[PDB]
Structures are given as C-alpha cells and as structure tokens.
Write a protein that binds this ligand. Structure first.
Ligand SMILES: [Cl-]
Ligand SMILES: [Cl-]
Ligand SMILES: [Cl-]
Ligand SMILES: [Cl-]
Ligand SMILES: [Cl-]
Ligand code: NA
Length: 129
C-alpha cells in the first residue's frame, strides 16, 4: 500500500506515535517519506547482507527475522514480512521499541539527514487529524 501523506499521519496518530518519546507527528511522517516514499512494500538490501523492510525500513540485523541474516537478532519478535503489510501496526510497534533504545530517531539515517532540524510540522500541514 502506498499511503497518502495525511492518510499516513492519521494512521500514525491513531497508533500513538504523536509525541512518542517526544517526537512530534511530523518527524514520523518525514522519516517514512524518505525511507520508503510511503510504500509499505519497500525493501532494500544492505552491504552486510541484512535487509530493510517496510514503511520505516526496519533492519533484519537487529529487529525482525527473515531467515537469511545469519547471526542477527529479532528484537521485535516478528517475521520481517509482517512489516510489509498494508496495516502499519507491526511497523509502529517495532518502531516504538527502536526509538526507545537510547538513540531516539537517529536510528533512521534518512531522518537524521533529511528531517532532523527542519520544519517537520510542514509534513502534517492541512491534514484533518
Ligand atoms: Cl508526499
Ligand atoms: Cl509535527
Ligand atoms: Cl536470520
Ligand atoms: Cl491499522
Ligand atoms: Cl531522544
Ligand atoms: Na534478524
């Protein structure tokens, strides 16, 4: 599923991401835009053989099991394929664990390079929330 901007903002708000660990909703929408272009089916392989999955590009090196990342962890206790669903619940719940692990949203490279320090409120401007 390819979300619209305001559609995704509303879904993320319903799932408790607005101001989660102090990160306003626009931060999460901006991260999803640049990680996946709002596409739940996005995948990208990393140099070390791990793979990033879904709307927030969560990495099989630490967070999910895909059966092909030897020596990795599965800290969200899910198969990585569950992060590709049109229902974003699994991605949101795993992202909550990630953002709580000490490094905040710096875990998302695209957030750090393209959202951090910008006017992220623009990503939810005009949306009925
Ligand atoms: Cl957009
Ligand atoms: Cl915001
Ligand atoms: Cl594995
Ligand atoms: Cl949902
Ligand atoms: Cl933080
Ligand atoms: Na893994």
């Amino acid at each position: 599923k390819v979300f619209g901007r305001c559609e995704l903002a509303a879904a993320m708000k319903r799932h408790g991401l607005d101001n989660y660990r102090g990160y306003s909703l626009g931060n999460w929408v901006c991260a999803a835009k640049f990680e996946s272009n709002f596409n739940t089916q996005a995948t990208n392989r990393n140099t070390d053989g791990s793979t990033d999955y879904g709307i927030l590009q969560i990495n099989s090196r630490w967070w999910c099991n895909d059966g092909r990342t030897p020596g990795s962890r599965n800290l969200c206790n899910i198969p990585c394929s569950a992060l590709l669903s049109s229902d974003i619940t699994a991605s949101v719940n795993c992202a909550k664990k990630i953002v709580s692990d000490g490094n905040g949203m710096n875990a998302w490279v695209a957030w750090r390079n393209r959202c951090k320090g910008t006017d992220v409120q623009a990503w939810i401007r005009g949306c009925r929330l």
